[PDB]
């Protein structure tokens, strides 16, 4: 309703960098809010793309941002009669960013890895990797849970079981309130998908530079499966956390698997041991149900609700025809130990190929009426096809079926405005939570400030 679409703030990265592909709010040790921005095609030291991360101080005028520097150099270690190798070319550093406490986690899902031993090798594969920074201290760490030193032949002899070579760890990421990093790795276990978790504190204390393969003993990974429903399911394409079992000392994980069961798609809610508590099945094959997931209590009963995006959902129209528009599903959490039901609300796109539901950001309570609200991105939506973000307000029965506000892209065609979204943080300290919108195709991010309701 009350985001200001007249006086925006723009931050800009280098041309071709995809600045804005990912973003998050970051609070420093003093509560000063900054914006962390991923730019996964930023050029590295060999004038080759490796990605980068920027940490933008809050200014109404916006502008250029300083880099948050990470080591962009390929590493080699000869040890244990093996040769360990990292390859950061085209790794996509900043394809996901997330902030927690005074720490920033920025991931490079396409970082490649190999191990040589005489004439054999592990195979050069995209294990992915995450880089962790504490900006104020300069501390740096890394976490790459899918690196191994097993040779190609042993996977073949063991029927490709527990094959983490194509994980793409960091493809999606989230940090629990207690500070456990949870990474989605949609290529894990030969394209089934996996989740990897470890406390941030243990990531920092276990890392040393140059080691490349090290143990983070408090870590926990999900499991391989023999069930074809999971094959090529990309479980971990999106991740979120929330409270869904009524027990406030356990944190539950929400995981999107948008090609689960022969492209039907699914989202699963699990406990922290990766045991499945609920599964939401997609409605339409190829809709990419699970592309995005969001967790927020929208109806003011103190129980977290789930939103799921299916950006390629085709809506039925006159004369037995179908129109790709995208859809968002709201599932309200019932009282007590019961199943999440059918959806409580379906929100459906209008613009053909608009990809409504491609991103869903909790906004907190934007209009200050006691119900949390959401923003849904349609990156190619709007009457001009340039991208739209739509705000829907919470209410006692769930969400309103009609947007309170629509933000049309201020950028040119092709910007992908809305592909990344983040809300629920008051960046200017005016007592209303604000919205940051990435437009990676324009290498920019737009800040919408919430203002008093008119």
């Amino acid at each position: 309703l009350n985001l200001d679409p007249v006086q925006l703030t723009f931050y800009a990265g280098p041309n071709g960098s995809q600045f804005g592909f990912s973003l998050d709010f970051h609070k420093d040790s003093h509560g000063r809010v900054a914006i962390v921005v991923g730019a996964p095609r930023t050029l590295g030291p060999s004038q080759e793309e490796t990605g980068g991360v920027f940490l933008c101080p809050w200014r109404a005028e916006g502008g250029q941002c300083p880099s948050l520097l990470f080591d962009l150099r390929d590493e080699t270690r000869n040890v244990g009669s093996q040769t360990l190798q990292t390859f950061k070319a085209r790794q996509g550093l900043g394809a996901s960013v997330v902030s927690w406490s005074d720490v920033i986690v920025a991931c490079a899902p396409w970082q490649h890895w190999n191990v040589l031993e005489k004439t054999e090798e592990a195979e050069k594969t995209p294990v992915g990797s995450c880089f962790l920074a504490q900006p104020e201290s300069g501390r740096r760490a890394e976490y790459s849970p899918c690196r191994g030193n097993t040779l190609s032949r042993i996977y073949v002899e063991n029927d490709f079981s527990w094959d983490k070579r194509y994980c793409e760890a960091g493809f999606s990421s989230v940090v629990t309130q207690a500070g456990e990093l949870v990474l989605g790795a949609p290529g894990g276990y030969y394209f089934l998908g996996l989740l990897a978790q470890a406390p941030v504190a243990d990531i920092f204390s276990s890392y040393r530079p140059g080691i490349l393969l090290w143990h983070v003993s408090s870590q926990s990974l999900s499991f391989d499966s023999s069930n074809p429903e999971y094959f090529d399911g990309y479980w971990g394409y999106s991740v979120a956390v929330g409270e869904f079992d009524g027990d406030l000392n356990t944190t539950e994980y929400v995981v999107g698997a948008p090609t689960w069961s022969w492209t039907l798609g699914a989202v699963e809610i699990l406990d922290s041991y990766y045991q499945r508590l609920h599964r939401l099945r997609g409605e339409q094959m190829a809709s990419y149900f699970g592309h995005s997931v969001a967790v927020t209590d929208v109806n003011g009963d103190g129980r977290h609700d789930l939103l799921v995006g299916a950006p390629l959902y085709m809506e039925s129209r006159a004369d037995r025809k179908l129109a790709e528009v995208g859809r968002v599903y709201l599932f309200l959490q019932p009282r007590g130990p019961h199943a999440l039901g059918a959806p409580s609300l379906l929100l459906t796109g209008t613009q053909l190929y608009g990809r409504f539901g491609s991103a869903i950001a909790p906004l907190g309570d934007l209009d200050r009426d006691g119900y949390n609200d959401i923003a849904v991105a349609a990156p190619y939506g709007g009457p001009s096809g340039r991208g739209q973000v739509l705000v829907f307000l919470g209410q006692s029965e769930g969400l309103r079926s009609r947007p309170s506000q629509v933000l049309d892209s201020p950028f040119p065609t092709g910007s992908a405005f809305g592909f990344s979204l983040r809300g629920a943080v008051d960046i200017d300290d005016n007592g209303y939570p604000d919205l940051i919108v990435g437009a990676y195709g324009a290498n920019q991010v737009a800040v919408y400030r919430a203002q008093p309701v008119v």
Partner: antibody
Amino acid sequence: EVQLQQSGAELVKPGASVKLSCTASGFNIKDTYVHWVKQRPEQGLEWIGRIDPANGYTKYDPKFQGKATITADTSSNTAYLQLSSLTSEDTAVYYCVRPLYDYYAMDYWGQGTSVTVSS
Amino acid sequence: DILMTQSPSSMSVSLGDTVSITCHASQGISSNIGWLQQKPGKSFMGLIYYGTNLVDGVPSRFSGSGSGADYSLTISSLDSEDFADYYCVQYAQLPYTFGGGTKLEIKR
């Protein structure tokens, strides 16, 4: 707290075999490589081999090919060293070892099992 | 196999001293070296891994340095508990090989 707890002193006849154990405490033995190391006062420290208890794959110094067999049972959280066709020169203290962080290192050691081979 | 020549085999030093123990490998091992301590009649504790990294719990009076084939363990200001045996180990290559050790004894 990580501790490797080895079996007690063994006292066996020459030509026999003995199976030393090393039980992980405060962790899953599956987490890292487990190594076995031989100490004598004269010859000093010698690496026997290692095992990855997750999958059972082993590596040995070729000097111990035939003598040393390293196995593991993740069910009992334990790694073993079997020495066959025992001799006076097999009389030593035997240690199981695992790394702290580095996959390839040798940082945590069990308390040692004493073996004496005599008639 | 990589030979690890550790020196000196023993030294008679005193409390407060700064003493260095060196280890020379028969070829470069790119800091894939660990240092170990064996107190009289007790088992081993790891001190250093990968050349220069302190094992958790080890006091900072211990430092490791070196590169290529030549490495050092330095102990600054010896405590009574530091009089013990020390061994290097390399893990650049299988089989892992150890130095012949260094016993710190009390001078008088």
